Design a protein around this ligand. Structure first.
Ligand SMILES: NCCC[C@H](N)C(=O)O
Ligand SMILES: [K+]
Ligand SMILES: [K+]
Ligand SMILES: [K+]
Ligand SMILES: [K+]
Ligand SMILES: [K+]
Ligand SMILES: [Mg+2]
Ligand SMILES: [Mg+2]
Ligand SMILES: [Mg+2]
Ligand SMILES: [Mg+2]
Ligand SMILES: [Mg+2]
Ligand SMILES: [Mg+2]
Ligand SMILES: [Mg+2]
Ligand SMILES: [Mg+2]
Ligand SMILES: [Mg+2]
Ligand SMILES: [Mg+2]
Ligand SMILES: [Mg+2]
Ligand SMILES: [Mg+2]
Ligand SMILES: [Mg+2]
Ligand SMILES: [Mg+2]
Ligand SMILES: [Mg+2]
Ligand SMILES: [Mg+2]
Ligand SMILES: [Mg+2]
Ligand SMILES: [Mg+2]
Ligand SMILES: [Mg+2]
Ligand SMILES: [Mg+2]
Ligand SMILES: [Mg+2]
Ligand SMILES: [Mg+2]
Ligand SMILES: [Mg+2]
Ligand SMILES: [Mg+2]
Ligand SMILES: [Mg+2]
Lengths: 117, 142, 110, 103, 34, 48
RNA sequence: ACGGGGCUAAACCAUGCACCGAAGCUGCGGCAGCGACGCUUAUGCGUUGUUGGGUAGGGGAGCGUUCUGUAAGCCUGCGAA
RNA sequence: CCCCGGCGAGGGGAGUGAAAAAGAACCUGAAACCGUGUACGUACAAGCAGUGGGAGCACGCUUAGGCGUGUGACUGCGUAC
C-alpha cells in the first residue's frame, strides 16, 4: 500500500498561496515565505480585533471633547453632567450627534450644565 | 452604521491671524498645534488634515520666562564629523526670529507625511505686516 | 487581421534580443525596417528576418497591403538552454548556459 | 427624525425605513418587535432627551432576516514553543426594518 | 576519495579548493588563536 | 446483515499512537521522548 | 543624565472632586468541558452551578490519502481521473 | 503544393486527422522562474512590508441607494521562521 503525495501536498500549498495574494515579492509566490506571512497576518488580525475597540472609543472621545468645548464645557465635566442627569447615551452616539445634529448636541450640553449647577 | 470620517476633498479650512507680542513661547505653540491639526473641530479625523491656516505676526517679540533668553540652547548637526552647532535663544531672535516659533510648533506636530502637511499651513512673520489680505484672515485673539 | 512570424530556438539570450525589440514596438513597418538596418547589433539581424517574414506572410496568406502594416505585438521568450562544461583552475568545473530565445512579431493593419 | 435605542448591549441611531443589523433575537421572520426603552427622539430640533428613557417613546420594527456573518479566522501562534491552533467563527445577526418612531 | 561524483567526475580529492587550511595560500599566522 | 452493515463493539478498536506527525497530534517533533540524553536516542535506554 | 517639544508650572508638598486608561469586571450573542437536579431518558434532551493561557508530557475525539471486501453494484464520451 | 529565408535554421498558409495548442524538442502539461497587454498606485520619502481604519480612481451590477471586484494616498499598532 504505497501512497504518493502529489495531489494532497499541492492542494495544501495552493490553499496557503491563495491567502497570500497581494503580498510583496516572495510573500505571494514562494510557499516557505507565504506560509510564514499568512500566520503573521493571523496574529495581527486577532490582536487588532481588540485594538479596533480601543481606537474607535479614542476617536469618539476626541470628537465629543471638540464639540463640547464649542459650547463652553470640557469632556470630563460633560460626562459627569450626563451621569448626574441620568442620561445613558454612549460615546458612539454622542460623537455621531456632534457631527450630524449640532443643535441636539447643544441640548445635551445644557442638560449636563444644569445637573452640575 | 459606520463612524463618520472627514473626506479631504470637502474639508472646510479657515484663515486666522495671531499676534505673538508678549506671548509665552510654549503656551502659544500648543494652541497653534491644536488648530493646525484640527483638534478643535467635531469633524476631526486622525488621518485627514482638517485644520486651519494661521498667520503669526511679530515673531521676534515672543516671550520666555526665567533665564531662558540666554540659557535655552538650540542644537543641530551638519552631517560632517565634529559638526555640532549651537545657538542661544537671543542669537536665534537676532538672526532669524521666525525659526523660534517654527521649531517649537514642529516638535508638537505628528511626525510623518501628514504632520509635514499640517506644518505648511503655518505662516510666520517677524513684523506686523503680512501680504495675505486676499485670504481675509480673521483675528484670533488667543 | 493580425499575422504572426516566429523564430524559435534563436541562438541568443532573451535579454539581448529584447533591447532591439523595444525599438520597433508600435511602429509602421516601413519605419521599423530602417531602424533595424542601422542598429549595430547581432539581434537586429535576427529581428529583421522575422519582421521581413511576417510582412511576406501578410501579403501572400492574408492579401494585405504593405503601407498599412504596423508592429502590433513583439515579444521575446526564453528557449531551452544548452549545458556546457568549462574548466577552471585547480580542477574546478563550471557549467556554461548557452541561452536561446523565441522571437515573435505580429503585424496588423488594424 | 431619528431615535436612539438600545438592543443587544449596544445602541443604535435609526430612522424610519432604515434597515438595521442587530444581535440575534428570538423572533420569527416577518414578526414585529417593539422597543420601549428608547433614549432620545429628535424631530426638527424638538429634542426629547430620555432620563434615561423617553416617557412614551416606542420604536416598532419588522424582522426581515436572520443569518450568519462573514467568517473570521482566529489564529494563535507562539514562536519557538511548538504551539499553534486555529479556529473559525461566524456571528449570528437579525436584520430589522424600522417601521415607526412614535414619540 | 570521492569516487562517483556526477558533477565533477574528473577529480576525487577536492578539499584543496574550499577548505581554508588546505589551500596553497593558507598561512599559519591565520591560526593565531593559540 | 450484509457485508457493509457489520460493526465492531464500541471501545474495542482503539487507534495506535503515530509519532512525529505535526503539532496538532500532540506527539510531533519528539514523539514523547523529551529533549536530549540516552533515553531519547534510537536504540537508547539502560538494561534491566 | 525630562522620550521629545516645550514648561516658572505643565515642578514639589497637602487636601478634594471629575475624567482617561487592559484581552481585569459588567452587558448582548455563540461554542465546549466537568458537577448537581430534572420535561424523561435508552443515553439523548431540559434547567442550574462552575470551568476553558500553556512547553516537556499524559488523556480523549476526529479529517484526509493509497489498497481489499460490499462491487458482474453505482457514476461516466450527453465527458471519469 | 505555395510563400519569406542562405537550394539554411525557423516560420506562415494548404492538406491529413475526432483533435496539429496530438507535428515527431509529440498524452495530460502543475510550481519555481522569464515576458507582453490592461486597471490602479508610485519620483519630500525612512525600518520583518503586514494588520486595523480609510479617501480617490477603474470596471461590473441595480437603482428613487450603495453593494461586488481590483488598486491603496494617508494614518494607529507592529524587530521573520
Ligand atoms: N591516479 C590518478 C587518478 C586521477 C583521478 N582523476 C583523481 O582525481 O584522483
Ligand atoms: K513519553
Ligand atoms: K492533446
Ligand atoms: K511546453
Ligand atoms: K506555468
Ligand atoms: K499601515
Ligand atoms: Mg582559468
Ligand atoms: Mg589539471
Ligand atoms: Mg508513531
Ligand atoms: Mg504537548
Ligand atoms: Mg530525558
Ligand atoms: Mg532536538
Ligand atoms: Mg539537558
Ligand atoms: Mg545507530
Ligand atoms: Mg544508543
Ligand atoms: Mg515622558
Ligand atoms: Mg470612567
Ligand atoms: Mg477594553
Ligand atoms: Mg477587557
Ligand atoms: Mg474575561
Ligand atoms: Mg487549554
Ligand atoms: Mg482564562
Ligand atoms: Mg475498492
Ligand atoms: Mg481519485
Ligand atoms: Mg488542419
Ligand atoms: Mg469529435
Ligand atoms: Mg489516448
Ligand atoms: Mg504536451
Ligand atoms: Mg505552460
Ligand atoms: Mg509625492
Ligand atoms: Mg523637506
Amino acid at each position: 500500500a504505497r501512497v504518493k503525495r502529489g495531489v494532497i501536498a499541492r492542494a495544501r500549498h495552493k490553499k496557503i498561496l491563495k491567502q497570500a495574494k497581494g503580498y510583496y515579492g516572495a510573500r505571494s509566490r514562494v510557499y516557505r515565505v507565504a506560509f510564514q506571512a499568512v500566520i503573521k497576518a493571523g496574529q495581527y488580525a486577532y490582536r487588532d480585533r481588540r485594538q479596533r475597540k480601543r481606537q474607535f472609543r479614542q476617536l469618539w472621545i476626541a470628537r465629543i471633547n471638540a464639540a463640547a468645548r464649542q459650547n463652553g464645557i470640557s469632556y470630563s465635566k460633560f460626562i459627569n453632567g450626563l451621569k448626574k442627569a441620568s442620561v445613558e447615551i454612549d460615546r458612539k452616539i454622542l460623537a455621531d450627534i456632534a457631527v450630524f445634529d449640532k443643535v441636539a448636541f447643544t441640548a445635551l450640553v445644557e442638560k449636563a450644565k444644569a445637573a452640575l449647577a | 452604521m459606520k463612524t463618520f470620517t472627514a473626506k479631504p476633498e470637502t474639508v472646510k479650512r479657515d484663515w486666522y491671524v495671531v499676534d505673538a507680542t508678549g506671548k509665552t513661547l510654549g503656551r502659544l505653540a500648543t494652541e497653534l498645534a491644536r488648530r493646525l491639526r484640527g483638534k478643535h473641530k467635531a469633524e476631526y479625523t486622525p488621518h485627514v488634515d482638517t485644520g486651519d491656516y494661521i498667520i503669526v505676526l511679530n515673531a521676534d517679540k515672543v516671550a520666555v520666562t526665567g533665564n531662558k533668553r540666554t540659557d535655552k540652547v538650540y542644537y543641530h548637526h551638519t552631517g560632517h564629523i565634529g559638526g555640532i552647532k549651537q545657538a542661544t535663544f537671543e542669537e536665534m531672535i537676532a538672526r532669524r526670529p521666525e525659526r523660534v516659533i517654527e521649531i517649537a510648533v514642529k516638535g508638537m506636530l505628528p511626525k510623518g507625511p501628514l504632520g509635514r502637511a499640517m506644518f505648511r499651513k503655518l505662516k510666520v512673520y517677524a513684523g506686523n505686516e503680512h501680504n495675505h489680505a486676499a485670504q481675509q484672515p480673521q483675528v484670533l485673539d488667543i | 487581421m493580425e499575422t504572426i512570424a516566429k523564430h524559435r530556438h534563436a541562438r541568443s539570450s532573451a535579454q539581448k534580443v529584447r533591447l532591439v525589440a523595444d525599438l520597433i514596438r508600435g511602429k509602421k513597418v516601413s519605419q521599423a525596417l530602417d531602424i533595424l538596418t542601422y542598429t549595430n547589433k547581432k539581434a537586429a539581424v535576427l529581428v529583421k528576418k522575422v519582421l521581413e517574414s511576417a510582412i511576406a506572410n501578410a501579403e501572400h496568406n492574408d492579401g494585405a497591403d504593405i503601407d498599412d502594416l504596423k508592429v502590433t505585438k513583439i515579444f521575446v521568450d526564453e528557449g531551452p538552454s544548452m549545458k556546457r562544461i568549462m574548466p577552471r583552475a585547480k580542477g574546478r568545473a563550471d557549467r556554461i548556459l548557452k541561452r536561446t530565445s523565441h522571437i515573435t512579431v505580429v503585424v496588423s493593419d488594424r | 427624525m431619528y431615535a436612539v435605542f438600545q438592543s443587544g448591549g449596544k445602541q443604535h441611531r435609526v430612522s424610519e425605513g432604515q434597515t438595521v443589523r442587530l444581535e440575534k433575537l428570538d423572533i420569527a421572520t416577518g414578526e414585529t418587535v417593539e422597543f420601549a426603552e428608547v433614549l432620545m427622539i429628535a424631530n426638527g430640533e424638538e429634542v426629547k432627551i430620555g432620563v434615561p428613557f423617553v416617557d412614551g417613546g416606542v420604536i416598532k420594527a419588522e424582522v426581515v432576516a436572520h443569518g450568519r456573518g462573514e467568517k473570521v479566522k482566529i489564529v494563535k501562534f507562539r514562536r519557538r514553543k511548538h504551539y499553534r491552533k486555529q479556529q473559525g467563527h461566524r456571528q449570528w445577526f437579525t436584520d430589522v426594518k424600522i417601521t415607526g418612531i412614535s414619540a | 576519495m570521492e569516487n562517483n561524483s556526477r558533477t565533477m567526475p574528473h577529480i576525487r580529492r577536492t578539499t584543496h579548493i574550499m577548505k581554508f587550511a588546505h589551500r596553497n595560500s593558507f598561512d599559519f599566522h591565520f591560526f593565531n588563536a593559540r | 446483515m450484509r457485508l457493509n452493515t457489520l460493526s465492531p463493539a464500541e471501545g474495542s478498536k482503539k487507534a495506535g499512537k503515530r509519532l512525529g506527525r505535526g503539532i496538532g497530534s500532540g506527539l510531533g517533533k519528539t514523539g514523547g521522548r523529551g529533549h536530549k540524553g540516552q533515553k531519547s536516542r534510537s536504540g537508547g535506554g539502560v538494561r534491566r
